[PDB]
Structures are given as structure tokens and as C-alpha cells.
Ligand binder design. Structure first.
Ligand code: FES
Ligand SMILES: [Fe+3]
Length: 102
């Protein structure tokens, strides 16, 4: 229901993040303690691409001004940020990463 095969599970590296372009949306995939999660690959604060980089635990650090989001809830943690980032449901199925894009 807007569910889409988006990547192989093992394309997302332990503890790190990757960027994908898919159906015209740029998306970040994250590996956090055995689970996969997803957000927009664009920082809400500026023209910054979250896939590069720095994921520490469940916190992703913007490469620009070091704003940080909780990857599981999309909530903004520290300044400069003011706006939460959009999250997308994922399920892992037969080694595939599925996304609910709206
Ligand atoms: S651009 Fe990501 S914190 Fe300002
Ligand atoms: Fe640290």
C-alpha cells in the first residue's frame, strides 16, 4: 500500500547509514542494533545530505552544522535544528528492505 522493495538488507552497513534515490525521493537507510530505519536524506535545516554522514547509535549527525536526529522517531535533538525529519516505515522481508512511502 505504497510498500516498495528498496534495497538488499546487507547493503546497509552495521552502525552506519546509506543514501538511495528511489521513485524521485532521496532516502536515508540506517542500521541500528539489528533494525533498519529510514528518513528523508535531506536535513531539515539546510542543504545537507544525511547519508554523509556519522550515525552514532540511533543518532544521525548532520555533516554541516552537527544537528542530530533520533533515527527511530525522526525527532530533532540539538540545535541548530528546529524541525523534525520525516520517517518512513520499514520491514525486512526475505533479505529485502521494504519502505512505506506515504
Ligand atoms: S544543515 Fe543540517 S544542521 Fe543546519
Ligand atoms: Fe561521540
Amino acid at each position: 500500500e505504497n510498500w516498495i522493495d528498496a534495497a538488499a538488507r546487507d547493503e546497509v552497513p552495521e552502525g552506519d547509514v546509506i543514501g538511495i534515490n528511489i521513485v524521485g525521493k532521496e532516502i536515508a537507510l540506517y542500521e541500528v542494533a539489528g533494525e533498519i530505519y529510514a528518513t528523508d536524506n535531506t536535513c531539515t535545516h539546510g542543504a545537507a545530505r544525511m547519508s554523509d554522514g556519522f550515525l552514532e547509535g540511533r543518532e544521525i549527525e548532520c555533516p554541516l552544522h552537527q544537528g542530530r536526529f533520533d533515527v527511530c522517531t525522526g525527532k530533532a535533538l540539538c540545535t541548530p535544528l528546529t524541525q523534525d525529519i520525516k520517517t518512513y516505515p520499514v520491514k525486512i522481508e526475505n533479505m529485502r528492505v521494504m519502505l512505506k512511502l506515504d
